[model samples]
Target: ASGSKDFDFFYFVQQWPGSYCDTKQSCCYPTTGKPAADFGIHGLWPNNNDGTYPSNCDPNSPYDQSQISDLISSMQQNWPTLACPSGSGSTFWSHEWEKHGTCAESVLTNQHAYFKKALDLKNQIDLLSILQGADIHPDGESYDLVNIRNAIKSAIGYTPWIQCNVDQSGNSQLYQVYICVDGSGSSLIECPIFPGGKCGTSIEFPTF
Candidate 1:
């Protein structure tokens, strides 16, 4: 009734680090709080819990090429405006996919599914663009990191527990996206990617 966005636990496994338990050798299950028998490589959950039929099929497992293609297709169909161009472009939309690594890919897939179910692509894109444009470190004082984090959470419908340091001399800014699943809202799973930084310490949109 609440919909997949409310209960779609895929993002949890994809982004956040799982909890460890002494009783079982593997990482603890996301739902029942039990560790797996074997801690699989690449940090994936070996057990799949679909509420009714729990099996060895890991629902939060890494997506294959076919799944990625399906997800890309879904994104193109719904949010055509955000689609990356084949040629040269001066927008973040173009570079985001190539520069952001697996994080971008995962976000695209998850967002596509979210849009398909909610049919709220327009509003979501608008909100994300705005939040992405907001100044992360407002004013010359360089404070209020919490404000930026909260804004991102409010816009994206997910609380991002971020860990970053200020790079004063870097040519481009870098951002790392991670997932949080333990309900503690702290641990992240996905590896960080360097998005390249610039002189400013703000989070505004590209002007071209």
Candidate 2:
């Protein structure tokens, strides 16, 4: 029922740190410290099944840290900005809230619920363990795309859109996993439009 600006589902996206900081891959990564090995939160995006999405839906929407003060510590642990001017990630949080969280107002009702839900979802996902179970370990080894796909599909009960990024050598590396979520933000559902994995049959799962 939450279709403001033509949105239907939430694209729960996660980023792999190794590929994210590759000089030729991600832009503007901070230079202070190395990012953690775990998959970091990219965002929960509201989208139409047809590939369209809504952003900046409210002119008055603001991201106040106080709303998520209790979850800030957890956010710092999980949803970090690989680098920033403040190195605090406050700016990145604000951008996510203003751009995507504002669009989630239909189901979430407010910024607090919006951010908290993303955190909750991230906590429930044991990405490392899941992949390890299928022998798709992140030891800088190349894995068959189908094997990686089956690993997640078997664990979460629905297929996800796998994304990849290239390093300086032009080798594709696993970058992000985008799972489709229903309107309430509590359930995973088959994507209305699966873009499918973008990489070749073999891709690198670079170490963090």
Candidate 3:
């Protein structure tokens, strides 16, 4: 159960691994293994564009890893946990389903379908290649935030909210990319607006 709440759109959040690590220390790892060089699926979050969201709603449908067994291998490979103690993969997944996925019951309706949708979306959004095609390589080189945004928006035919974080060397770099999806959870939609978070005039396109 729903607690009499209305669902909005879905936010498919992807994160860059190279910049995932901060200057604080060596970054954490997932329980399964190290994440790939490409951007990792942080989650498929349900939210309203008004800058609000629901979380930890509906205990009636609890998170169960067994429900996503078939997707485990790919999850471990492509979506490996990149936090301290690496054993937090399952924990993170559980929290995502409970906090975010459960709120999406109006659309996804099941754990398997939910995880599959996320994995499928990750496969469809090729951020790295699109940038490369525009000569925006991740060779630890710096790039204009506008170019990165334009390149992605032009390729996907929609504008995406790009966010950044610092690397071990104290340089700000590409961190997270958030794309909007329709409430039906079946198709991508153009974002009417975006939150260009803390992105400087130029930031490094870190290599993982």
Candidate 4:
């Protein structure tokens, strides 16, 4: 199966807000309040083993805020938006739903299931804590990217993809972490292909 009917796996992406706010484009905390200084859920993106994936797959199933009413609190905290012009999370949620969530409908079934599953995955993987356990703190200091990857890999039993963005001073900082999840969104697995060449030898885990 291919296209919207099926996908090989998922890339459960989490973004480090500090890096997000430190970049040239910068960012604003959502109207709700400042999010925890931890990696926030970006999206549970459905992907394929072949490196290509689907998007905007179902226009009929457009994002309806009421459909995920029960998830408001969870989404506000776990998947808060850090985009500019700081507003409610709905804007961000709608984009993710339309662009990525729709493509995941074949397995996730609905909008609620899609968002909830992503939240559950974020809960299961405490990226900040896992990094702290290995003495990797977001103290505006830099560390070897390999050590960072090894720390999370040892804890999760699967290697994750690390992405970086240049800080204001042109230093590369940790931006996002991508973990491969099974098609059902229930288990983490080794990536069939990684989003490689996005990090440097040393990268900063800047303070939020």
Clashes of each: 10, 0, 8, 0
lDDT of 1 by residue, 1-208 (tens): 0332222122222111111111123322322222122111111111112432112222343333343455443333332221123211123222322322223222234423422322232323233343446743312233244565567666655664333323333212212232333211123322222123332334321111
The number of the candidate with the highest TM-score is 4
TM-score-superior candidate, 1 or 4? 4
Stretches > 4 Å off in candidate 3 = 1-5
> How does each model score on TM-score?
0.28, 0.91, 0.91, 0.96
Please provide, for model 4 over 82-183, each residue's C-alpha lDDT reduced to its tens digit, 9 standing for 90 to 100: 998899998999999999999998889999899989988888899999999999999988899999999999999999999998999999989999999988
Model 4's TM-score against the true structure: 0.96
The lDDT values for all models are 0.29, 0.83, 0.83, 0.90
Runs in model 2 with CA error above 4 Å? Answer: 1-6, 25-33, 84-86, 195-197
Model 2 clash pairs? none
Better of 1 and 4 by lDDT: 4
Which portions of model 1 show Cα errors greater than 4 Å?
1-68, 72-127, 130-143, 156-158, 165-174, 179-208
**Could you tell me the lDDT of residue 59 within candidate 2?**
67
Clashing pairs in 1: 15-179, 15-189, 16-189, 171-197, 172-196, 172-197, 172-198, 173-196, 173-197, 173-198
Q: After superposition, how far is residue 92 of candidate 3 from its true place, in Å?
A: 1.4
